[PDB]
């Protein structure tokens, strides 16, 4: 009924202390069957796709959220992150969100 959309706001930033837990949000909009969403981290000119991580779906009213879990948050997590969606055979990216540790 509608297009898949990733609503991370431009210039998003979260300043957190190491040793504490954190949940990084990726607002996903969908009208069909839930789309495949993934997370990456900016390292120079490429966004390094993150493997084997704790992630969760949190369904709301008009929106839904894909979350990356930092259980806990380490100092070697300071950087800018992004979520991407591959559905109709192409990759759609969101705005990058920065994490200050």
């Amino acid at each position: 009924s509608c297009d898949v959309q990733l609503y991370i706001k431009r210039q998003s930033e979260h300043s957190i202390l190491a040793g504490d837990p954190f949940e990084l949000e990726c607002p996903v909009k969908y009208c069909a069957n839930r789309p495949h969403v993934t997370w990456c981290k900016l390292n120079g000119t490429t966004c390094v796709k993150l493997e084997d991580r704790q992630t969760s779906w949190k369904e709301e009213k008009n929106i839904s959220f894909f979350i990356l879990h930092f259980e806990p948050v380490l100092p070697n997590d300071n950087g800018s992150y992004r979520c991407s969606a591959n559905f109709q055979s192409n990759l759609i990216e969101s705005h990058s969100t920065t994490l200050y540790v």
Partner: antibody
Amino acid sequence: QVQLVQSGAEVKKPGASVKVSCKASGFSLSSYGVSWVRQAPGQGLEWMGAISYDGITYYASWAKSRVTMTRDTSTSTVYMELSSLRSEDTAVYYCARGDYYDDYVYVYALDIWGQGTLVTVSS
Amino acid sequence: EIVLTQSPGTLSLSPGERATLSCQASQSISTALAWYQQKPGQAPRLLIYAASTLASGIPDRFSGSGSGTDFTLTISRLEPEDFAVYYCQQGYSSSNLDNVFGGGTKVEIKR
């Protein structure tokens, strides 16, 4: 004002490389992306790729193997290097500023364009 | 992959008249569709961004419409400075593509 100024014309041998520069004035490179678009004589527009606001590079599927895109945020200059040049690469190369007009959706249009750089490739 | 297809290839219209430019995407691109004008020996110029919005200092005779795959650029009162070549561009995705642009449409004077 808000402008994009490119380097002078280039004449190259086949198998050589070319590095095109593109200077931003009136704005910040760390807020905008820069796309590269080439045009052959009498032909249509051909996207080569871009370096976004957050420093990530995208390349056209045909250009990934010979094209490199950089930025020097202090000098506020973007570059494009096209290596192992072929005669069929002769074109006018443009840098265009990518405006991510939407604050929630990662989408763009190219509002300010460079004056073009003619690169001739021949033996 | 995302393929932008422009129609017609060329349109012979007299000044004063109305132009209807068509751009079709192979798969949906939401409203990440822009329209440019290129006159001979000049760099392209942004007309309409976000499928329907007007760019900085662009006259009101240029109107954009559409969402997903079907898109139109309409010039209602074709002036002589309007006789140029027009290209559509998707800002939707950039990963593993041949070109973010359509093949263009030349608008020429019918006489």
